[PDB]
Design a protein around this ligand. Structure first.
Ligand code: 1DA
Ligand code: ZN
Length: 349
């Protein structure tokens, strides 16, 4: 009984936030790097969350395992290949994964992440590796998968390189650019590196998406929409607080990448108030359901579909409708996007 047993489309899910607990254990032992636990079960409880934390508290979880992956080509390519497999079983036909290429490299990276020792896995080298694994998984499982490179809010200096990686791997799995990281950092959406990269994304034709409103105020969403020029808004829950900006985003048809379970676990959604998605459903807004970081939220695309069905009262029509919108809002090229839409309709009949 999986709430929605039909093809699906996921526009918001981090790759480094969706790794099997078994592969983390495998590379921790093979590299001799420590892990908080030596059992996928105990490793699932240390890395996972059961109750709400905060954006900066949940982001630390990564410190536990990113060092086991970062720097290893074999691991980077493997996690990308298994990610597809995961989404293939979930009944997802098209996905757009997002990850920071700089956080997985150990060479040519401004501030070395995870106290690594210089190596040869460059950032350009990780977009390639992830492209290979994603492509293999595509031939092996049968689902389309494209990627989205992220700009980290705290590291603006990296931003322009992310833009160059996007231009270089355009369509070669890379279809867009994103701005993730700690949203609580004041004025991070305005740092010049980010602003400049997005200005370059607008003139070079690189799609854009921006994590905003997940935990910040409406001003942040307003900056992602007017100054950064997003085409999609990651989360955008708090947007409803500024009635004017919300009704205008509802008019332009802005797409809101929603992640329900994740908003409860990061604290982006007070469980006493009505979830912004309920208002997105009642207003017939353009939005998709996503998983964000299944490994840390101990979830699966189904989790989110069950959470909206049981609470919030979501029906199957709404599930087929928000998925058709996600396919329309995807960053696929027209031709491929048409095929995607041709597929869901045939399967939704
Ligand atoms: N829920 C989230 C909010 C902001 N940033 C996130 C979230 N999930 C993952 N990220 C960040 O995006 C990076 C790339 O996936 C991760 O290393 C993590 O830092
Ligand atoms: Zn996210």
């Amino acid at each position: 009984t999986p709430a929605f047993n039909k093809p699906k489309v996921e526009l918001h899910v981090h790759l480094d936030g969706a790794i099997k607990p078994e592969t983390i254990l495998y590379f921790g032992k093979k590299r001799g790097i420590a892990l908080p636990a030596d059992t996928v079960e105990e490793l699932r409880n240390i890395i996972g969350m059961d109750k709400p934390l905060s954006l900066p508290g949940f982001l630390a979880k990564f410190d536990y395992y990113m060092p086991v992956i970062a720097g290893c080509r074999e691991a980077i390519k493997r996690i990308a290949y298994e990610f597809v497999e995961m989404k293939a079983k979930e009944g997802v036909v098209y996905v757009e994964v997002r990850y920071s290429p700089h956080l997985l490299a150990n060479s040519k990276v401004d501030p070395m992440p995870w106290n690594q020792t210089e190596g040869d896995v460059t950032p350009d080298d990780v977009v390639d590796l992830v492209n290979q694994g994603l492509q293999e998984g595509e031939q092996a499982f049968g689902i389309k998968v494209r990627s989205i490179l992220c700009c980290m809010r705290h590291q603006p200096s990296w931003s322009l390189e992310v833009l160059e990686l996007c231009k270089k791997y355009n369509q070669k799995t890379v279809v867009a650019m994103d701005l993730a990281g700690d949203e609580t950092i004041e004025g991070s959406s305005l740092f010049p590196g980010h602003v400049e990269a997005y200005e370059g994304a607008v003139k070079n034709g690189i799609h854009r998406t921006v994590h905003a409103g997940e935990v910040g105020s409406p001003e942040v969403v307003r900056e992602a929409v007017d100054i950064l020029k997003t085409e999609r808004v990651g989360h955008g829950y708090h947007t409803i607080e500024d009635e004017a900006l919300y009704n205008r985003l509802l008019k332009e048809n802005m797409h809101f990448e929603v992640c329900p379970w994740s908003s409860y676990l990061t604290g982006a959604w007070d469980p006493k108030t009505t979830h912004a998605v309920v208002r997105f459903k009642n207003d017939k807004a353009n939005y998709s359901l996503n998983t964000d970081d299944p490994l840390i939220f101990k979830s699966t695309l189904d989790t989110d579909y069950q959470m909206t069905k049981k609470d919030m009262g979501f029906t199957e029509e709404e599930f087929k409708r928000l998925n058709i919108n996600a396919a329309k809002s995807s960053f696929l090229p027209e031709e491929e996007k048409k095929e995607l839409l041709e597929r869901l309709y045939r399967e939704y009949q």
